[PDB]
């Protein structure tokens with residue numbers, strides 16, 4: 581009942597005040613099986629791609645974070661080839677940053693920010709991370725080509 585009331589409010593806010601570039605909605609009729617979309621940001625290599633994500637709300641929400649993975653392939657130091665995301669707010673403390681005062685909208689915004697600003701210090705993709713650090717022009721070209729191939 582606690583989780584239910586919280587999800588109703590989140591779905592209302594996602595429907596009426598979505599963050600710029602972000603959409604999140606119910607796949608069907610269950611408030612804990614959600615989908616989202618993040619628009620590729622301008623001045624990023626993902627520009628003019630559209631990235632779909634799966635947003636699964638666990639039983640203990642809001643005390644456990646949403647489980648979010650990219651469905652659209654993306655070329656990024658912190659996102660693996662299955663769409664898993666390495667991001668602090670998707671993880672529980674002490675290492676992670678999730679807390680019940682965050683919500684689906686804030687963490688989708690954090691993923692959007694991660695797309696703009698990767699964290700080569702916490703890589704999931706070692707070869708992409710090294711390319712991002714030491715050969716940024718190649719990283720940007722590869723990230724654009726992957727966006728053309730899979731997100732457009």
Ligand SMILES: Cc1cc(=O)n2[nH]c(C(F)(F)F)nc2c1
Nearest residue numbers: 589590593594597598599683685
């Ligand atoms: C988009 C959005 C804006 C906003 O202010 N909130 N607040 C909550 C909360 F508190 F219900 F979890 N969800 C949201 C979502």
